[PDB]
Amino acid sequence: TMSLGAENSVAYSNNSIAIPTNFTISVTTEILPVSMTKTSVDCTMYICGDSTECSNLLLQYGSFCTQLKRALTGIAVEQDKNTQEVFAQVKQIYKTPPIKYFGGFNFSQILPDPSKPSKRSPIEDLLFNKVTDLICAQKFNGLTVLPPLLTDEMIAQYTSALLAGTITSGWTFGAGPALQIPFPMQMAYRFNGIGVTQNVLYENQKLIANQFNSAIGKIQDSLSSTPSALGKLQDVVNHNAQALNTLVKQLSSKFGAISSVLNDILSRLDPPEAEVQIDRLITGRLQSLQTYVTQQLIRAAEIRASANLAATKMSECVLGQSKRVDFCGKGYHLMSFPQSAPHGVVFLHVTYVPAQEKNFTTAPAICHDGKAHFPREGVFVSNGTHWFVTQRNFYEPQIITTDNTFVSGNCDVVIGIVNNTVYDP
Amino acid sequence: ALGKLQDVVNHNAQALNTLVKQLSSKFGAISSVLNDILSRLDPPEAEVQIDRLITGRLQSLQTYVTQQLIRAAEIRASANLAATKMSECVLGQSKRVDFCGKGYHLMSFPQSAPHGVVFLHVTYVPAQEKNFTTAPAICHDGKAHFPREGVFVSNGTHWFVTQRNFYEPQIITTDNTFVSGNCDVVIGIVNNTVYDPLQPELDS
Amino acid sequence: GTGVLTESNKKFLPFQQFGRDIADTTDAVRDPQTLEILDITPCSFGGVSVITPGTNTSNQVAVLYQGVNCTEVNVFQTRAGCLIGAEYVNNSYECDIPIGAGICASYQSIIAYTMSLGAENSVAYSNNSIAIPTNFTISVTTEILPVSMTKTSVDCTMYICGD
Numbered sequence: 001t002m003s004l005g006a007e008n009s010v011a012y013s014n015n016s017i018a019i020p021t022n023f024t025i026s027v028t029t030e031i032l033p034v035s036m037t038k039t040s041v042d043c044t045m046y047i048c049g050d051s052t053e054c055s056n057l058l059l060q061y062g063s064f065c066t067q068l069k070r071a072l073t074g075i076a077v078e079q080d081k082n083t084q085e086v087f088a089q090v091k092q093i094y095k096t097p098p099i100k101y102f103g104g105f106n107f108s109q110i111l112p113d114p115s116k117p118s119k120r121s122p123i124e125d126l127l128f129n130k131v132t133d134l135i136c137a138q139k140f141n142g143l144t145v146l147p148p149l150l151t152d153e154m155i156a157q158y159t160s161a162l163l164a165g166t167i168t169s170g171w172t173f174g175a176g177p178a179l180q181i182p183f184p185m186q187m188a189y190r191f192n193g194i195g196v197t198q199n200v201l202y203e204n205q206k207l208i209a210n211q212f213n214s215a216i217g218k219i220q221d222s223l224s225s226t227p228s229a230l231g232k233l234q235d236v237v238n239h240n241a242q243a244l245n246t247l248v249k250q251l252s253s254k255f256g257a258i259s260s261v262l263n264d265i266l267s268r269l270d271p272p273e274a275e276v277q278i279d280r281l282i283t284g285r286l287q288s289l290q291t292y293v294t295q296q297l298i299r300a301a302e303i304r305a306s307a308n309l310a311a312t313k314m315s316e317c318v319l320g321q322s323k324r325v326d327f328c329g330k331g332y333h334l335m336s337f338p339q340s341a342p343h344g345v346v347f348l349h350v351t352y353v354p355a356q357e358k359n360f361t362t363a364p365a366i367c368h369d370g371k372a373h374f375p376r377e378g379v380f381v382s383n384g385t386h387w388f389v390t391q392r393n394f395y396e397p398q399i400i401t402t403d404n405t406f407v408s409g410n411c412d413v414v415i416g417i418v419n420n421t422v423y424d425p
Numbered sequence: 426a427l428g429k430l431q432d433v434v435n436h437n438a439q440a441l442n443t444l445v446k447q448l449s450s451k452f453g454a455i456s457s458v459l460n461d462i463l464s465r466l467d468p469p470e471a472e473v474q475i476d477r478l479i480t481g482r483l484q485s486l487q488t489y490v491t492q493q494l495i496r497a498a499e500i501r502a503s504a505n506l507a508a509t510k511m512s513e514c515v516l517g518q519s520k521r522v523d524f525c526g527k528g529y530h531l532m533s534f535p536q537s538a539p540h541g542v543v544f545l546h547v548t549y550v551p552a553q554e555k556n557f558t559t560a561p562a563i564c565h566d567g568k569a570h571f572p573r574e575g576v577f578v579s580n581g582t583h584w585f586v587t588q589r590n591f592y593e594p595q596i597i598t599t600d601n602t603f604v605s606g607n608c609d610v611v612i613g614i615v616n617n618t619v620y621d622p623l624q625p626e627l628d629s
Numbered sequence: 630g631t632g633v634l635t636e637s638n639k640k641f642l643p644f645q646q647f648g649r650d651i652a653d654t655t656d657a658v659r660d661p662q663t664l665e666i667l668d669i670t671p672c673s674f675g676g677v678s679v680i681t682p683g684t685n686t687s688n689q690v691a692v693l694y695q696g697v698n699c700t701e702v703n704v705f706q707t708r709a710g711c712l713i714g715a716e717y718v719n720n721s722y723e724c725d726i727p728i729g730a731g732i733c734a735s736y737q738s739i740i741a742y743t744m745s746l747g748a749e750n751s752v753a754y755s756n757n758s759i760a761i762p763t764n765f766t767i768s769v770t771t772e773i774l775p776v777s778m779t780k781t782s783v784d785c786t787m788y789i790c791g792d
């Protein structure tokens with residue numbers, strides 16, 4: 001019987017709080033499929049090939065062929081639209097400065113490599129390597145794979161522009177003109193977004209930079225060392241080729257006829273029964289093609305939903321800081337980096353995870369001079385003998401003064417109010 | 426401009442037209458008209474011809490219903506998205522980037538359209554940006570000062586604190602800065618005075 | 630069948646006569662007069678696509694043979710296929726008519742080009758400089774979303790059989 005999880009009992013009490021005293025910069029990967037293989041089918045060539053009599057009999061069924069071609073054309077344009085929606089979200093191609101110094105933060109693994117001809121990042125190069133006469137057989141039966149409108153190098157260029165915008169300008173480029181800001185100041189703004197003061201980032205800048213660099217290196221090692229990391233994108237490739245193979249395989253099916261070869265049927269039988277045999281082959285092949293188009297449409301809907309989600313993540317996680325829980329990684333979200341992948345996008349979510357929490361005795365309000373004092377932005381904590389006010393997400397005790405507390409009412413209404421002095425500047 | 430809604434209308438009529446067009450298909454039978462088949466053949470072979478017509482027309486109708494269900498799923502997803510935009514953009518102000526227009530979202534207006542909704546997203550776009558020299562903190566009297574809500578900027582000789590999204594320089598005082606630590610830890614801290622409001626009061 | 634018979638590097642065993650693909654399609658054969666192996670490759674086929682602007686504007690057209698090399702058919706070779714009737718221009722513009730593999734076509738005659746992704750902007754990043762907005766623009770933008778479709782009901786018996 002499978003275990004759901006490790007058992008943890010939270011030490012809940014009416015007057016105790018746990019405050020984090022440290023943090024971990026966690027980078028996590030999110031892999032999203034964006035597009036599929038664009039397929040076009042020649043209905044007449046697939047069902048009948050070179051046989052004129054088969055085409056003449058096929059004409060009796062009407063506009064089935066036109067319907068299948070139209071549906072496939074809609075899917076093919078939809079895939080390009082999906083790629084445009086996910087990646088072509090900036091109209092300026094931003095570039096990084098020639099001096100790659102960002103206050104200790106290292107972005108070598110995600111920025112484009114000049115040495116490589118493909119102009120891809122090490123992570124993107126790893127993603128393309130790790131995602132992989134079949135093509136000839138699919139082509140020879142009247143099924144054609146159409147090239148993506150955006151080539152891999154242009155998609156990589158779009159990711160590079162997004163990375164340059166998010167690194168040099170923060171979230172400003174997503175909401176208008178790209179405004180330059182130093183990267184430590186940008187990270188301080190992101191720290192303020194999740195409710196941590198700027199001083200925590202500035203004082204611990206080298207530690208945060210080291211943690212970020214270590215996490216990025218771990219991400220590259222994790223992708224290189226795990227076969228099932230890129231399972232989703234490969235699955236899409238796996239489905240598409242298999243579908244074409246199955247459709248090709250359906251040409252070798254008798255479908256209740258004497259032979260699967262039209263030429264043998266013509267060369268061996270009179271037209272009254274040859275017409276019947278060709279009709280059986282036509283209905284079986286047409287059913288196979290309709291089945292293939294129907295699954296292609298269902299997969300197109302699923303990929304369109306995934307692409308819409310990927311576009312939403314690109315807008316909310318890469319082009320801004322998100323306050324939505326778990327949308328842009330596990331933890332308090334700081335920023336995200338896009339990486340191009342075959343038929344998809346990989347988001348590196350940089351999040352803030354609290355760590356090394358410590359118990360403190362807490363009170364809702366402080367009673368001083370017959371007045372109730374409440375924290376403006378923090379929480380009251382006690383280490384045993386002395387009372388302090390600290391920010392909720394990091395332990396930084398400060399003296400309780402009138403500057404950081406506000407007075408509302410007397411001490412007779414608040415349940416759990418404790419008596420302590422409030423300093424006056 | 427209104428290509429998406431018209432496209433939906435274009436698909437629906439076309440689907441019906443295709444289904445109507447499928448009535449003119451022999452489907453491997455002598456004729457596409459059932460009345461002719463009845464008026465021309467005995468029931469043993471008329472049953473076969475009617476069977477061919479029935480299976481072809483039934484396949485056409487099932488195909489039409491299948492694409493109608495797929496399109497219904499797509500339109501349901503679009504309608505759910507439209508309801509989400511109506512709740513978050515019209516009935517409130519959204520902090521989600523690009524959900525309610527390009528730029529910092531202020532408000533949205535709904536307009537009815539045939540088979541659809543048009544959202545007029547009113548957003549705030551920054552413009553006419555100006556370069557300034559910036560610092561993370563101000564060092565005064567051996568203490569590090571950080572902005573409460575803004576950013577430190579310098580026009581070349583003087584330091585000010587301004588809000589991030591609009592240029593409004595103000596004198597750096599204790600009211601708009603907070604003190605955390607000394608000047609030895611912050612990388613890039615610059616030396617500047619921090620004004621005290623109480624100093625002229627007790628001085629005079 | 631029907632196909633080109635090219636020279637084959639495949640060494641058949643003496644008992645084998647035909648050859649098949651992974652997907653069970655014939656890819657090779659042994660000639661019964663001279664014991665040699667031939668690579669049966671089917672003749673070239675392509676999806677003829679016509680690239681045109683509006684008839685209100687012009688009647689000039691270009692033809693794209695999808696998947697067909699240009700030697701087997703203003704002739705330009707693209708990864709999508711062979712494009713006849715459009716002149717390649719080294720300038721980059723926005724995409725007007727999509728061709729594929731980064732190639733787009735436009736009317737100015739019909740030209741084919743590698744589409745520009747966007748205007749090139751280099752952000753003046755430095756470790757101590759910030760850009761602060763001094764003004765604003767109130768921008769109203771349109772977002773069009775479909776909500777409902779036409780409600781259709783079909784009488785199954787009347788449609789299939791009538792009276």
Ligand SMILES: *[C@@H]1O[C@H](CO)[C@@H](O[C@@H]2O[C@H](CO)[C@@H](O)[C@H](O)[C@H]2NC(C)=O)[C@H](O)[C@H]1NC(C)=O
Binds near residue numbers: 009010011018
């Ligand atoms: C806060 O105090 C509580 C209680 O003193 C701690 O909870 C105990 O944790 C230990 C080991 O984790 C367990 O063996 C005890 O059974 C727990 N007691 C209760 C009542 O839950 C808690 O670990 C303290 N928090 C920190 C961060 O030290």
Ligand SMILES: *[C@@H]1O[C@H](CO)[C@@H](O[C@@H]2O[C@H](CO)[C@@H](O)[C@H](O)[C@H]2NC(C)=O)[C@H](O)[C@H]1NC(C)=O
Binds near residue numbers: 210356
């Ligand atoms: C917070 O945790 C970090 C680690 O994530 C601590 O940094 C380590 O500090 C020890 C002792 O000074 C060093 O030996 C390690 O090399 C440091 N690790 C890294 C990655 O820099 C840090 O000291 C902790 N801070 C507090 C206040 O507990």
Ligand SMILES: *[C@@H]1O[C@H](CO)[C@@H](O[C@@H]2O[C@H](CO)[C@@H](O)[C@H](O)[C@H]2NC(C)=O)[C@H](O)[C@H]1NC(C)=O
Binds near residue numbers: 100106107108
């Ligand atoms: C940023 O990270 C890269 C890679 O993580 C660092 O490049 C390494 O540099 C060391 C010492 O110079 C070499 O021994 C490694 O072989 C390099 N690895 C790679 C993959 O190039 C780089 O030094 C870091 N710092 C900067 C400023 O770029």
Ligand SMILES: *[C@@H]1O[C@H](CO)[C@@H](O[C@@H]2O[C@H](CO)[C@@H](O)[C@H](O)[C@H]2NC(C)=O)[C@H](O)[C@H]1NC(C)=O
Binds near residue numbers: 383
């Ligand atoms: C709670 O924290 C306060 C503040 O750090 C502690 O007060 C200081 O304790 C040190 C060590 O005994 C003394 O050298 C200082 O003179 C104390 N400062 C003041 C203003 O009294 C206090 O001891 C802590 N309490 C507990 C139980 O750890």
Ligand SMILES: *[C@@H]1O[C@H](CO)[C@@H](O[C@@H]2O[C@H](CO)[C@@H](O)[C@H](O)[C@H]2NC(C)=O)[C@H](O)[C@H]1NC(C)=O
Binds near residue numbers: 367419
């Ligand atoms: C907090 O302080 C107040 C005032 O200093 C205390 O209220 C006094 O309590 C004593 C005995 O309980 C009475 O004799 C006084 O008349 C009370 N004064 C007022 C103004 O109410 C209160 O008891 C203190 N609470 C704690 C927990 O120490």
Ligand SMILES: *[C@@H]1O[C@H](CO)[C@@H](O[C@@H]2O[C@H](CO)[C@@H](O)[C@H](O)[C@H]2NC(C)=O)[C@H](O)[C@H]1NC(C)=O
Binds near residue numbers: 581583
């Ligand atoms: C930076 O801004 C400050 C304040 O806006 C400027 O200081 C004032 O400049 C005007 C014009 O020269 C003088 O009339 C005032 O007397 C100055 N005020 C003070 C308090 O000195 C300053 O000149 C600006 N610096 C630059 C390089 O533009």
Ligand SMILES: *[C@@H]1O[C@H](CO)[C@@H](O[C@@H]2O[C@H](CO)[C@@H](O)[C@H](O)[C@H]2NC(C)=O)[C@H](O)[C@H]1NC(C)=O
Binds near residue numbers: 564615616
């Ligand atoms: C910022 O101010 C501090 C303190 O006034 C400066 O530190 C002094 O620097 C001088 C010359 O380097 C020394 O002679 C003093 O002993 C230093 N005093 C202290 C307390 O450190 C610092 O140099 C100033 N920084 C800038 C950039 O002007």
Ligand SMILES: *[C@@H]1O[C@H](CO)[C@@H](O[C@@H]2O[C@H](CO)[C@@H](O)[C@H](O)[C@H]2NC(C)=O)[C@H](O)[C@H]1NC(C)=O
Binds near residue numbers: 555556751752753760
């Ligand atoms: C901020 O200063 C930088 C550099 O001092 C300006 O960037 C220059 O812009 C001009 C015109 O756009 C270019 O010709 C230069 O090549 C740029 N130089 C660099 C180093 O990028 C930038 O325009 C200034 N910002 C504003 C708003 O004027």
Ligand SMILES: *[C@@H]1O[C@H](CO)[C@@H](O[C@@H]2O[C@H](CO)[C@@H](O)[C@H](O)[C@H]2NC(C)=O)[C@H](O)[C@H]1NC(C)=O
Binds near residue numbers: 553763764765
């Ligand atoms: C901010 O931009 C607005 C326009 O978007 C400026 O308003 C213009 O001001 C000029 C000169 O004062 C007038 O001739 C125009 O008629 C104004 N246009 C509008 C639409 O009102 C405004 O002056 C700018 N403000 C700053 C500080 O640069």
Ligand SMILES: *[C@@H]1O[C@H](CO)[C@@H](O)[C@H](O)[C@H]1NC(C)=O
Binds near residue numbers: 014015415416
């Ligand atoms: C908290 O609970 C303890 C025991 O459960 C009790 O003695 C104490 O009065 C309670 N305090 C408040 C503020 O409820």
Ligand SMILES: *[C@@H]1O[C@H](CO)[C@@H](O)[C@H](O)[C@H]1NC(C)=O
Binds near residue numbers: 612613756757
């Ligand atoms: C910023 O970089 C310049 C050179 O690029 C250097 O002279 C200066 O010391 C740096 N300042 C900080 C705060 O890193």
Ligand SMILES: *[C@@H]1O[C@H](CO)[C@@H](O)[C@H](O)[C@H]1NC(C)=O
Binds near residue numbers: 661662664
């Ligand atoms: C096949 O025919 C050719 C014709 O010249 C002859 O030379 C050869 O011996 C025959 N047999 C085989 C096994 O090739």
